[PDB]
């Protein structure tokens, strides 16, 4: 059960991240290809190392998703100096095996993708030179998690800095909320007052 919900979320978050990367021009347009998921046009990256990086990131998270130990998955955008400008927070909440209800929930997720696709319509451009990162917030205190989250040796995870997180102001900009009996997730952006 709770296992397949993870596969879904993992499948989702993977696309979201690729789209976010395009839409915020974190990488150039020429490495992306248009595909379709969630019966929608997306941009996925054809750079294998980048793809591998993301797959890896999300293989690791999968197992915590199953136990509903994850509270947030945040994509973070960092500038040249190395300070977080934007953040795509995906806040998760989870409450006996379905079928159509599963595809319903899955299709819905397209509402989100479509927000990300046009979000630029509401954010202010980033400065040239940005990179990203993914942070996972646990409901409980990162550490039982710590042994479990190293699913892929060679892809290790550490504990976050105050550096990595920190960012006053910022500005909150909602994007989508959804509620099912089995999954609730809200995606919004926090966005440094001065990107410069």
């Amino acid at each position: 059960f709770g296992q397949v919900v993870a596969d879904v979320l993992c499948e989702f978050l993977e696309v979201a991240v690729h789209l976010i990367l395009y839409v915020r021009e974190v990488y150039p347009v020429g490495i992306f290809q248009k595909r379709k998921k969630y019966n929608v046009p997306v941009q996925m990256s054809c750079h294998p190392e980048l793809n591998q990086y993301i797959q890896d990131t999300l293989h690791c998270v999968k197992p915590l998703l199953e136990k509903n130990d994850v509270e947030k998955v945040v994509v973070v955008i960092l500038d040249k100096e190395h300070r977080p400008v934007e953040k795509f927070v995906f806040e998760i909440t989870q409450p006996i095996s379905s079928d159509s209800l599963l595809s319903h929930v899955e299709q819905l997720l397209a509402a989100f993708i479509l927000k990300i696709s046009v979000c630029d319509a509401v954010l202010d451009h980033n400065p040239p030179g940005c990179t990203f990162t993914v942070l996972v917030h646990t409901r409980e205190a990162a550490t039982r998690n710590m042994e479990k989250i190293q699913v892929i040796k060679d892809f290790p995870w550490i504990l976050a800095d105050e550096q990595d997180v920190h960012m006053h102001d910022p500005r909150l900009i909602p994007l989508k909320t959804m509620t099912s009996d089995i999954l609730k997730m809200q995606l919004y952006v926090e966005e440094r007052a001065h990107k410069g």
């Binding site: 750079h47 990086y53 990162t133 996972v136 892809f155 550490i158 997180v165």
Partner: peptide
């Protein structure tokens, strides 16, 4: 407190340009 991140950073923009036309 509750916050994990991959040790590794993703491919830089430059690294990626080398492979494109």
């Amino acid at each position: 407190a509750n916050i994990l991140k991959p040790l590794m950073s993703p491919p830089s923009r430059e690294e990626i340009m080398a492979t494109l036309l």
